[PDB]
Amino acid sequence: MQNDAGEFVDLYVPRKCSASNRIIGAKDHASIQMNVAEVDKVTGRFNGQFKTYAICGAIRRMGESDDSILRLAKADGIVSKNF
């Protein structure tokens, strides 16, 4: 939200589900934020760098979060587009 002077007027901007493009509400206690370690390419070891995803509670309780986290990890380089 902006006004005609171009300044912003929301209290905060809420996050959206990485699998589904829908807003995660302030009381969605079934939702999660996932965090995953990157590894260096010469020795397969943690360098302290990481990647993150957020998942809606409605997609978790129907059983679709495992396949959603897998598609996200194949779209990024982690699973390397072969299986």
Partner: protein
């Protein structure tokens, strides 16, 4: 029996969006459906789409982006005049800031905001937001 094809196309998209599916299949295809989809795509509510030839009216596959709240049809194609269009957008839209009525006019199928620039009335087809 199937009395109207545009009502099937929009009800099929609307049920697929609510289940969170990434694609949908529309059958039968029509010249009216391809022109209605193009108006939603130009305003940013759906992704790109592909048509299959089968020698019997054809089929369409559509890509969904998760932005669409609803799309729908008004079944009798009532006539509208520029003076009465305010009453229809007061009834059907969620806010004055977003959402669109779709009209058919002798200048083409179009968005209700374009019909005011072109100074033309027409018949109502449907809406999206």
């Amino acid at each position: 029996v199937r009395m109207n094809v545009l009502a099937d196309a929009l009800k099929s998209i609307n049920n697929a969006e609510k289940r969170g599916k990434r694609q949908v299949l529309i059958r039968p295809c029509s010249k009216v459906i391809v022109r209605f989809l193009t108006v939603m795509m130009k305003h940013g509510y759906i992704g790109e789409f592909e048509i299959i030839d089968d020698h019997r009216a054809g089929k369409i596959v559509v890509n969904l982006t998760g932005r669409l709240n609803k799309c729908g049809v008004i079944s009798p194609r009532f006539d509208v005049q520029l003076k009465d269009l305010e009453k229809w957008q007061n009834n059907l839209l969620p806010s004055r800031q977003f959402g669109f009525i779709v009209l058919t006019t002798s200048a083409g199928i179009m968005d209700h905001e374009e019909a005011r620039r072109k100074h033309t009335g027409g018949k109502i087809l449907g809406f999206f937001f």
